[PDB]
JSON list of C-alpha atoms in Angstrom, two decimals:
[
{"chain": "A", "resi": 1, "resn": "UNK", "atom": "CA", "xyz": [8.81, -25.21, -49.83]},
{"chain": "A", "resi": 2, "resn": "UNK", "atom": "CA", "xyz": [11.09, -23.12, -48.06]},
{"chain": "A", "resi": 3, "resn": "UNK", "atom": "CA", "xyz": [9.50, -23.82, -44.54]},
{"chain": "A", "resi": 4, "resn": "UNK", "atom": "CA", "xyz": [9.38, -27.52, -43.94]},
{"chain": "A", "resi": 5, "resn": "UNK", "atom": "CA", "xyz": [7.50, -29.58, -40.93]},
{"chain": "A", "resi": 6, "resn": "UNK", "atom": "CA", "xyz": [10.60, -30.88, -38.50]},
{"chain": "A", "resi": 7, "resn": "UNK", "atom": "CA", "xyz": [13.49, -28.12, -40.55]},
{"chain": "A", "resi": 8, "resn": "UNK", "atom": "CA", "xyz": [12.49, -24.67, -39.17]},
{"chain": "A", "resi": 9, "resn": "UNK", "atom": "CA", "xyz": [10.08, -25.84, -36.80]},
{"chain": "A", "resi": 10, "resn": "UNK", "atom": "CA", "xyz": [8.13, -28.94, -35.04]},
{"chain": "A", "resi": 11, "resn": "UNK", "atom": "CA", "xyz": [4.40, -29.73, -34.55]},
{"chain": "A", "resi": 12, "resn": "UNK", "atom": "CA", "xyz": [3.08, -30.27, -31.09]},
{"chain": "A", "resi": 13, "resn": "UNK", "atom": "CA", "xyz": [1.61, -33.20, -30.54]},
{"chain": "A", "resi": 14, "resn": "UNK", "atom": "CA", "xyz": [-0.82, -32.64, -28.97]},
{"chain": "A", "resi": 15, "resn": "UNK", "atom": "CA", "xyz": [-1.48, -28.76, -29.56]},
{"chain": "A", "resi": 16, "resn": "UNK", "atom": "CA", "xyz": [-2.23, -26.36, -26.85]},
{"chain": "A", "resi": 17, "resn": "UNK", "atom": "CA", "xyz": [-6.31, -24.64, -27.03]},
{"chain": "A", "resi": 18, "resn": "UNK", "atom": "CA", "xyz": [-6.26, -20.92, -25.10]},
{"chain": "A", "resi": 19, "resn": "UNK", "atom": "CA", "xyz": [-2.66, -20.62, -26.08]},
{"chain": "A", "resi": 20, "resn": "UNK", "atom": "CA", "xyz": [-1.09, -16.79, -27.01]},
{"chain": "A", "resi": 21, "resn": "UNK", "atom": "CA", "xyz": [-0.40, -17.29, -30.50]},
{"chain": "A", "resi": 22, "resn": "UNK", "atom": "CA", "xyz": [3.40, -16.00, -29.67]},
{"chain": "A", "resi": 23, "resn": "UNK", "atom": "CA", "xyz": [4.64, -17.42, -27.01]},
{"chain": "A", "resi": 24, "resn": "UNK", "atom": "CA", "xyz": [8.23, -17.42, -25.71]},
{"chain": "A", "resi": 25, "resn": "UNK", "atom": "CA", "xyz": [9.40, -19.35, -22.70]},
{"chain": "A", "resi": 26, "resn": "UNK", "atom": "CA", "xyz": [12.77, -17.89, -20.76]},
{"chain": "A", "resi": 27, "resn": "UNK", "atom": "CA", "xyz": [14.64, -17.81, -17.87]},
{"chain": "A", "resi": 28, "resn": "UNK", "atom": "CA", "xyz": [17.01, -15.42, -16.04]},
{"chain": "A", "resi": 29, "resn": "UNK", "atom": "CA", "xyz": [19.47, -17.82, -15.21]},
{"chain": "A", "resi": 30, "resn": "UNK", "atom": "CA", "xyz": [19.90, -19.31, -18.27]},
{"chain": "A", "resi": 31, "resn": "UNK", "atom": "CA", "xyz": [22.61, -18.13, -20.70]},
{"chain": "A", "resi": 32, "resn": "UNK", "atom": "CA", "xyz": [21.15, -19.14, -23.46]},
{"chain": "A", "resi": 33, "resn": "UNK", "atom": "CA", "xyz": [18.11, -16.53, -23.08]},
{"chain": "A", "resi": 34, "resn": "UNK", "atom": "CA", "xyz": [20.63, -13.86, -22.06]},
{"chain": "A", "resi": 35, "resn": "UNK", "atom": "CA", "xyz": [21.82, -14.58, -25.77]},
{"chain": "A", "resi": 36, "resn": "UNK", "atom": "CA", "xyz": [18.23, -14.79, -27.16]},
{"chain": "A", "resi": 37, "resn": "UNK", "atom": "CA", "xyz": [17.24, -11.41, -25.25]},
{"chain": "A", "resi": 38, "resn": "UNK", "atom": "CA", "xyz": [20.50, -8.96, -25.51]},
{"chain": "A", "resi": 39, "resn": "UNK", "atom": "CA", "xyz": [22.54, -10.36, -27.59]},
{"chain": "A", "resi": 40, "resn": "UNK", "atom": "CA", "xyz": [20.75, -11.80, -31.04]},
{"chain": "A", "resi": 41, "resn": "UNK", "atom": "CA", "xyz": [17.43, -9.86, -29.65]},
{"chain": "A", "resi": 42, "resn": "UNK", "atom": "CA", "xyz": [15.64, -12.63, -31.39]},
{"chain": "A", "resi": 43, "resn": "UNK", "atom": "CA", "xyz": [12.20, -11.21, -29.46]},
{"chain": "A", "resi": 44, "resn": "UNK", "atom": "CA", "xyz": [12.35, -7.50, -30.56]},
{"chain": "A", "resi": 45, "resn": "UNK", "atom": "CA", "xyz": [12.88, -9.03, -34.15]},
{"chain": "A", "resi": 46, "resn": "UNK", "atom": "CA", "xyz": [10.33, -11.50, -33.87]},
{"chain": "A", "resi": 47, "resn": "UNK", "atom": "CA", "xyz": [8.04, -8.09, -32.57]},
{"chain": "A", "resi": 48, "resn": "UNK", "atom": "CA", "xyz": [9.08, -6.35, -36.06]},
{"chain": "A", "resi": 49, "resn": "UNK", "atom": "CA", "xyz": [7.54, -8.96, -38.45]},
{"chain": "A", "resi": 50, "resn": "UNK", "atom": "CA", "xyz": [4.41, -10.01, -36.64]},
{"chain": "A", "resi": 51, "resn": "UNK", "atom": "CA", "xyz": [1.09, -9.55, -38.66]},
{"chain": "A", "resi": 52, "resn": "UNK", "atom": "CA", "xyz": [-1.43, -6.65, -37.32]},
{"chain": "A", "resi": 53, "resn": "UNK", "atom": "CA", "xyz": [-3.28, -7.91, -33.85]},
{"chain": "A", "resi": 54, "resn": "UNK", "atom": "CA", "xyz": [-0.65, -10.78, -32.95]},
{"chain": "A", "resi": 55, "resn": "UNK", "atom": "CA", "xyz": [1.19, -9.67, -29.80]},
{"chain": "A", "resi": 56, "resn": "UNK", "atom": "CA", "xyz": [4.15, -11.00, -28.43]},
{"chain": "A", "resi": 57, "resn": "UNK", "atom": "CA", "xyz": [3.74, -12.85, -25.14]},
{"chain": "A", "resi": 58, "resn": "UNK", "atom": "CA", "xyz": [6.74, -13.68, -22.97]},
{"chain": "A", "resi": 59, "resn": "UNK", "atom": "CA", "xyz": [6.83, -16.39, -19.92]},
{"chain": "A", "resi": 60, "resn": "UNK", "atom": "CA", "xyz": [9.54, -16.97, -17.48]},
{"chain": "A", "resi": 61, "resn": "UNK", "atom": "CA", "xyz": [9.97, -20.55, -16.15]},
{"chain": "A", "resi": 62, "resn": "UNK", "atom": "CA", "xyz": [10.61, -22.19, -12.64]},
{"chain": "A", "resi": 63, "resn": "UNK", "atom": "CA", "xyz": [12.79, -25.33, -13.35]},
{"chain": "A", "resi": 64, "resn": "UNK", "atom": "CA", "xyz": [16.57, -23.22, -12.68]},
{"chain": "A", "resi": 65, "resn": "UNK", "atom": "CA", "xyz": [17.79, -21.78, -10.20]},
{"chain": "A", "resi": 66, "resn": "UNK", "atom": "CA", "xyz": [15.74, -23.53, -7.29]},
{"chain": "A", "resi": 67, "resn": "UNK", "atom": "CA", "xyz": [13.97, -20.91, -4.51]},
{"chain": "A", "resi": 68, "resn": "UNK", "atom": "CA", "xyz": [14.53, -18.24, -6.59]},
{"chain": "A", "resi": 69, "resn": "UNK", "atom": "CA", "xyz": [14.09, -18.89, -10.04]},
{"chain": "A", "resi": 70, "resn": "UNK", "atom": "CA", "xyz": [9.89, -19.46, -8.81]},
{"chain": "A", "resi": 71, "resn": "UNK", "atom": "CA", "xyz": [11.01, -16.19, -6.96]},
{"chain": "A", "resi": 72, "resn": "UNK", "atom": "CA", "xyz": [12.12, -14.70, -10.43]},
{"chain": "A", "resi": 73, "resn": "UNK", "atom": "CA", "xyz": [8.91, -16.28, -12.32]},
{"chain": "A", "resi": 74, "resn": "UNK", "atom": "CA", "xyz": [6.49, -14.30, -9.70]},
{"chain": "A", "resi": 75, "resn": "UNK", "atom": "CA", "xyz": [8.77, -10.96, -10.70]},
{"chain": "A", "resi": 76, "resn": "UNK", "atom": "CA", "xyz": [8.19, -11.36, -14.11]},
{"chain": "A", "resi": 77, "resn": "UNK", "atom": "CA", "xyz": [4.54, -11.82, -13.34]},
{"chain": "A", "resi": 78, "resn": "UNK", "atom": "CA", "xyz": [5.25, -8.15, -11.85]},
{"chain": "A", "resi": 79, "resn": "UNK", "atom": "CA", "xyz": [7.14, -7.05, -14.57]},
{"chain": "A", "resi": 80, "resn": "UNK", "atom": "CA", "xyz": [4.31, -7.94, -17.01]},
{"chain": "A", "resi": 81, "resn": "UNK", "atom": "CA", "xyz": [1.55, -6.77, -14.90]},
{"chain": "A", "resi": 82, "resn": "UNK", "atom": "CA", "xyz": [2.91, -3.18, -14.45]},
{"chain": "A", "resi": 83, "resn": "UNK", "atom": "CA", "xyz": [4.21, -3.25, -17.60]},
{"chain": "A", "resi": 84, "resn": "UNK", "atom": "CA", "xyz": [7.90, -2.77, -17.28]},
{"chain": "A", "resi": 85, "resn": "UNK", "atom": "CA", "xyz": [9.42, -5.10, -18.66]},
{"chain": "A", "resi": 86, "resn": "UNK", "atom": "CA", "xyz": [11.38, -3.37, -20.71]},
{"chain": "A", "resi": 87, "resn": "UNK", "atom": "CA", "xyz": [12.81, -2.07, -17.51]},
{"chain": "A", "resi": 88, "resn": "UNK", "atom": "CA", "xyz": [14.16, -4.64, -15.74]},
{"chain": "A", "resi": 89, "resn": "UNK", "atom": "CA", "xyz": [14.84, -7.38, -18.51]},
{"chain": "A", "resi": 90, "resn": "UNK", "atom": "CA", "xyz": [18.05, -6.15, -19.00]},
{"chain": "A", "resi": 91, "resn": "UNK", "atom": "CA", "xyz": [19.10, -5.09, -15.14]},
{"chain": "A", "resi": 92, "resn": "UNK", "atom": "CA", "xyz": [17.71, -9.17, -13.64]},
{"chain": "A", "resi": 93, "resn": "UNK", "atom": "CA", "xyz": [19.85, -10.81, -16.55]},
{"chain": "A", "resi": 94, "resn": "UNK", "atom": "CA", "xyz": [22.66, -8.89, -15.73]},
{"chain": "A", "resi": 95, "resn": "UNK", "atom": "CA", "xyz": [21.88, -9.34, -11.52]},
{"chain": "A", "resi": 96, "resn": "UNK", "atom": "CA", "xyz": [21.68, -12.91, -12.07]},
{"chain": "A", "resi": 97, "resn": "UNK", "atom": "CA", "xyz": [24.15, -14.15, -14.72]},
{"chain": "A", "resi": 98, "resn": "UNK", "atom": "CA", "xyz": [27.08, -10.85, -15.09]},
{"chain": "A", "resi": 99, "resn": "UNK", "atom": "CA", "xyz": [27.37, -9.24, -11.22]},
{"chain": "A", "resi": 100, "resn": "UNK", "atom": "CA", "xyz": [25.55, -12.26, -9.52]},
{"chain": "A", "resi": 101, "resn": "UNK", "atom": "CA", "xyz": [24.53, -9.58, -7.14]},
{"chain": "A", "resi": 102, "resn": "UNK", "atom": "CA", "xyz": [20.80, -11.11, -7.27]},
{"chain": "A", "resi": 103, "resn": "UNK", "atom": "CA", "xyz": [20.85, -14.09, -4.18]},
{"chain": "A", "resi": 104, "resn": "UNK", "atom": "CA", "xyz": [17.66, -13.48, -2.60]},
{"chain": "A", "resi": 105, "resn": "UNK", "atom": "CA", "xyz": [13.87, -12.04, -3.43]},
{"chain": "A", "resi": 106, "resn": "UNK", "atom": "CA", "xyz": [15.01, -9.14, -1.80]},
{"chain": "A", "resi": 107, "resn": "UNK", "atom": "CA", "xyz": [17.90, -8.39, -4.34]},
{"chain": "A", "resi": 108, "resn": "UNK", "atom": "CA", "xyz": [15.29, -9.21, -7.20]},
{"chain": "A", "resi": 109, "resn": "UNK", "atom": "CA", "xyz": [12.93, -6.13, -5.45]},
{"chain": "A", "resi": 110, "resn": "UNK", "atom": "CA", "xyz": [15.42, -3.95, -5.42]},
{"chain": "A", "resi": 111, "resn": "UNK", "atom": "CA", "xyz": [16.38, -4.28, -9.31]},
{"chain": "A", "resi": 112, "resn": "UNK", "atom": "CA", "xyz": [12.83, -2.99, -9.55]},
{"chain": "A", "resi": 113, "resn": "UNK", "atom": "CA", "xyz": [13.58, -0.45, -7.03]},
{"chain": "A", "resi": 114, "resn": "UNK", "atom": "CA", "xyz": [16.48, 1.14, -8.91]},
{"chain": "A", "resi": 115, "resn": "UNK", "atom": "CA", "xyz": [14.93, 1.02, -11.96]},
{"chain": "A", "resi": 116, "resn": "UNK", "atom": "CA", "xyz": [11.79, 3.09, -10.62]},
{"chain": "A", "resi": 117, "resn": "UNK", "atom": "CA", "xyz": [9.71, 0.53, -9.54]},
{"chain": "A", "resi": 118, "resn": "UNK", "atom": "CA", "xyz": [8.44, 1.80, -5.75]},
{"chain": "A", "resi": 119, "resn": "UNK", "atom": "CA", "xyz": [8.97, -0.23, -2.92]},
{"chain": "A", "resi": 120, "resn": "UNK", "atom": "CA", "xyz": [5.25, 0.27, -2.24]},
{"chain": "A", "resi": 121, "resn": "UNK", "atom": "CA", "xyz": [4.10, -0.70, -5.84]},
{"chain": "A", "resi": 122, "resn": "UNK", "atom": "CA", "xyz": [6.10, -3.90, -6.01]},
{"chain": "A", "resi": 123, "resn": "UNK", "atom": "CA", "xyz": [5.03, -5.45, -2.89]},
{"chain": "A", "resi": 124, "resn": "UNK", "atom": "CA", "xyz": [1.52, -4.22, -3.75]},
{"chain": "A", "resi": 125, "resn": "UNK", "atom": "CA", "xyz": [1.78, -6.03, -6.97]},
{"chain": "A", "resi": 126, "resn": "UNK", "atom": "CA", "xyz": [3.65, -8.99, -5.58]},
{"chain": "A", "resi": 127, "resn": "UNK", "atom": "CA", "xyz": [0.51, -10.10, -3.67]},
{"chain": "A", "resi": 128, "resn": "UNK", "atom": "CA", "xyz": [-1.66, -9.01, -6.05]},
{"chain": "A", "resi": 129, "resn": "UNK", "atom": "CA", "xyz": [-4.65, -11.54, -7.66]},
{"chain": "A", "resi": 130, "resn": "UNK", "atom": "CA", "xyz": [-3.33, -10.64, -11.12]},
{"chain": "A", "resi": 131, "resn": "UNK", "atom": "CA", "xyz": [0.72, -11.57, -10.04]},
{"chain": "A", "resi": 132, "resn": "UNK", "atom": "CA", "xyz": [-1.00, -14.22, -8.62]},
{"chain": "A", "resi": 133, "resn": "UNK", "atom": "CA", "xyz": [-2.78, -15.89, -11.74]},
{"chain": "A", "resi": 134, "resn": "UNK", "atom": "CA", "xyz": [0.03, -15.07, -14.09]},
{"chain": "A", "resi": 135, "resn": "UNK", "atom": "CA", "xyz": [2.31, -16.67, -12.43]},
{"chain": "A", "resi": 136, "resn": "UNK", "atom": "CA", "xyz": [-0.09, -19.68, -12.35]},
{"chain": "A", "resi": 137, "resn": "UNK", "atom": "CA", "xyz": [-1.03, -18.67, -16.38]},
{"chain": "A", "resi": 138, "resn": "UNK", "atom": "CA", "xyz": [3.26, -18.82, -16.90]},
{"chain": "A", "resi": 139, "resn": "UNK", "atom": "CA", "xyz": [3.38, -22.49, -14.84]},
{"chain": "A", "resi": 140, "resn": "UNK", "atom": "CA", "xyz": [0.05, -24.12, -16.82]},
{"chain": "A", "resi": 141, "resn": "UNK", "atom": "CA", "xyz": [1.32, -22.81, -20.07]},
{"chain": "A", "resi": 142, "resn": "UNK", "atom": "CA", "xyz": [5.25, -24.47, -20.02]},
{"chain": "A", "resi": 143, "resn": "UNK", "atom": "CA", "xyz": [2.96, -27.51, -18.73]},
{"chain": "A", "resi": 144, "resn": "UNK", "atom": "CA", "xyz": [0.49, -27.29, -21.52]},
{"chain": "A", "resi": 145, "resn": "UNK", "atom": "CA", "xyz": [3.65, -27.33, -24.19]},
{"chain": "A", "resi": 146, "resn": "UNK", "atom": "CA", "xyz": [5.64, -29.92, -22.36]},
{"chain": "A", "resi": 147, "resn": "UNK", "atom": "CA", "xyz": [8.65, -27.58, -21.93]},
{"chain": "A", "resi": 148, "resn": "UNK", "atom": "CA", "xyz": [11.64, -29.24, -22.49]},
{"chain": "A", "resi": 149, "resn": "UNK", "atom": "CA", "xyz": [14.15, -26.43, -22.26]},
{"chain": "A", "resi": 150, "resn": "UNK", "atom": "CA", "xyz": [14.51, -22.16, -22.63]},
{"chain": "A", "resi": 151, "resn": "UNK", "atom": "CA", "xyz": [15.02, -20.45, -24.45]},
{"chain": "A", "resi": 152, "resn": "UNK", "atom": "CA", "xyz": [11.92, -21.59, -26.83]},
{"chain": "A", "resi": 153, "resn": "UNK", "atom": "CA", "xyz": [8.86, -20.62, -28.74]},
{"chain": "A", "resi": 154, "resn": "UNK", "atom": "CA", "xyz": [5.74, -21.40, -29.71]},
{"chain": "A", "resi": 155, "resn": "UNK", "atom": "CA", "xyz": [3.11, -20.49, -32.67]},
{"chain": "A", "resi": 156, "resn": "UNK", "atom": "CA", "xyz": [-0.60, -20.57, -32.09]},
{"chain": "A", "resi": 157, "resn": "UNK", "atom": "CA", "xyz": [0.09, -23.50, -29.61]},
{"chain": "A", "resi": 158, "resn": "UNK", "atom": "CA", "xyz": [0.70, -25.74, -32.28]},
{"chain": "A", "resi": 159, "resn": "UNK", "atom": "CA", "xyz": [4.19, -25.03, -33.37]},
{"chain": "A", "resi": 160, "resn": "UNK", "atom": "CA", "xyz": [7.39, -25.04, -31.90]},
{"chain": "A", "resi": 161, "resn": "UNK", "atom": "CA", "xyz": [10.35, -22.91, -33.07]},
{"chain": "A", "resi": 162, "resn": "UNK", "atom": "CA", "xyz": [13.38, -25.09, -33.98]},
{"chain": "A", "resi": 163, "resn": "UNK", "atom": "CA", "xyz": [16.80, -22.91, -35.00]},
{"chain": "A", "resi": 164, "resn": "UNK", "atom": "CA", "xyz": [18.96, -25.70, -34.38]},
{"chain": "A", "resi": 165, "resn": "UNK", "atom": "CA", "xyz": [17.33, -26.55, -38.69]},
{"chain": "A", "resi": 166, "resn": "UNK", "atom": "CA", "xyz": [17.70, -22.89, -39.52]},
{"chain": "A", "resi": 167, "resn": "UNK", "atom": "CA", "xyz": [20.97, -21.39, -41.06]},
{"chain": "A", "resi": 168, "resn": "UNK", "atom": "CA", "xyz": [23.41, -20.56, -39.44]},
{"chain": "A", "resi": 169, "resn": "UNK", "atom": "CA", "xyz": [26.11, -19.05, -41.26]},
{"chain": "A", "resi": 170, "resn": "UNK", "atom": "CA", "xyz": [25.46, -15.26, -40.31]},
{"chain": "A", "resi": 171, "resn": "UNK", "atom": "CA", "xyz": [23.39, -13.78, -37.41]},
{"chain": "A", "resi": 172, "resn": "UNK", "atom": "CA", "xyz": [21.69, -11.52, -39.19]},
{"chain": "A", "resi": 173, "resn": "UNK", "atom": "CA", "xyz": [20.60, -14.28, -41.80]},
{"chain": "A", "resi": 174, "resn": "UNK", "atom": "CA", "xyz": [19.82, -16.11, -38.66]},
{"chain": "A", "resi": 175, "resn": "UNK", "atom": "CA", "xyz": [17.67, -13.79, -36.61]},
{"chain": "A", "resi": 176, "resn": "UNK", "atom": "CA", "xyz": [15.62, -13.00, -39.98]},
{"chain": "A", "resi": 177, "resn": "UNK", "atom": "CA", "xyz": [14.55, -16.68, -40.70]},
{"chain": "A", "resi": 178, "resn": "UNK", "atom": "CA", "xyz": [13.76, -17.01, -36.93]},
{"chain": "A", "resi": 179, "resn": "UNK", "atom": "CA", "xyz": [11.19, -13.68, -37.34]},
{"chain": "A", "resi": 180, "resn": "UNK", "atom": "CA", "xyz": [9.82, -14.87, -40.89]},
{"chain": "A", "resi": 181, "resn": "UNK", "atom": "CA", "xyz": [9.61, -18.64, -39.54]},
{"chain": "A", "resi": 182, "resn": "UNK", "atom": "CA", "xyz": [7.57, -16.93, -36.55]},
{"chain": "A", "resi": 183, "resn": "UNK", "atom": "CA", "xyz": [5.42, -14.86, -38.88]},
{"chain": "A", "resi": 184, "resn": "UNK", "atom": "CA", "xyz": [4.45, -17.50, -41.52]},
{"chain": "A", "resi": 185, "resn": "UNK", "atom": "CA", "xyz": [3.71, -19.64, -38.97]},
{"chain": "A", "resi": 186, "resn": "UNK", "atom": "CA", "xyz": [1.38, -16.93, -37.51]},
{"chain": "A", "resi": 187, "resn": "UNK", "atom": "CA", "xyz": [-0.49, -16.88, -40.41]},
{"chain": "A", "resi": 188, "resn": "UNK", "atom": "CA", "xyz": [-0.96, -20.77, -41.18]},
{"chain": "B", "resi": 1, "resn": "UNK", "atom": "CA", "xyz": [22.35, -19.41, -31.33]},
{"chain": "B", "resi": 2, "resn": "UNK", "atom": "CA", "xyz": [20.38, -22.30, -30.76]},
{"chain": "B", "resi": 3, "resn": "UNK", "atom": "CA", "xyz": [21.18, -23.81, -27.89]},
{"chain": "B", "resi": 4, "resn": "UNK", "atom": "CA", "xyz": [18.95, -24.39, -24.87]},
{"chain": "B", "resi": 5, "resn": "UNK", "atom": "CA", "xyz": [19.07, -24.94, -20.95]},
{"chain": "B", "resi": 6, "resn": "UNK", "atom": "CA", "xyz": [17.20, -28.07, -20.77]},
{"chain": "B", "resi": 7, "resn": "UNK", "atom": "CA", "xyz": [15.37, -29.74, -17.53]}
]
């Protein structure tokens, strides 16, 4: 039936209540979601074929890259809050995985720095209450899922994406039955 | 395209 239980996806067992009905799960140091992000830009396709009203929500995780990867899921918390990701995505994958250049918090501030985040604003939003509670909201919900690795998705916290049964014999072919699987699964 | 960086 062209989308089978266990083939282009899994069922939770036990599903996930006050889930975002998109949810992805990343991290910066993982090469994998460099791929996911930049490369096959699985998200931005996902974004293309979602229904009306269904946004696409995006959580970093803690569990690489020790001190700093928690350091790297309170930026993202940043990132989200001021609403820039799109703005330092690219630059913190790059710091962390191409130049390396990103060893401490400090490096990860000034990413947002250069990419006109103010010194001011960050800080401000680093000890924020809303940083604050995403980054606890980003922590419950790879809990909630039982997050086993990134990059990874999840439907209505119910279903998780599985490309490992999708085809793979083009990219393009690929990335489309990844955004459909995510859609129809949106709307079941 | 599907691989993962697993705990």
């Amino acid at each position: 039936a062209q989308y089978e239980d266990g083939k282009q996806y899994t069922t939770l067992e036990k599903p996930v209540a006050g889930a975002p009905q998109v949810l992805e799960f990343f991290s910066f140091f993982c090469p994998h979601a460099y791929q996911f992000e930049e490369v096959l830009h699985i998200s931005d396709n996902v974004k293309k074929k979602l229904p009306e009203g269904v946004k696409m929500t995006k959580y970093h995780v803690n569990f690489m890259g020790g001190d700093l990867g928690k350091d790297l899921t309170q930026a993202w918390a940043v990132a989200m809050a001021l609403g820039v990701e799109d703005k330092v995505t690219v630059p913190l994958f790059e710091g962390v995985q191409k130049t390396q250049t990103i060893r401490s918090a400090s490096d990860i501030r000034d990413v947002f720095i250069n990419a006109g985040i103010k010194g001011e604003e960050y800080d401000a939003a680093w000890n924020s209450f809303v940083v604050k509670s995403l980054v606890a909201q980003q922590e419950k919900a790879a809990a909630d899922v039982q997050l086993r690795g990134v990059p990874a998705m999840f439907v209505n916290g119910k279903y998780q994406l599985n490309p490992q049964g999708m085809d793979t014999s083009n990219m393009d072919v690929f990335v489309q039955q990844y955004a459909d699987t995510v859609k129809y699964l949106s709307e079941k | 395209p599907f691989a993962t960086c697993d705990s």
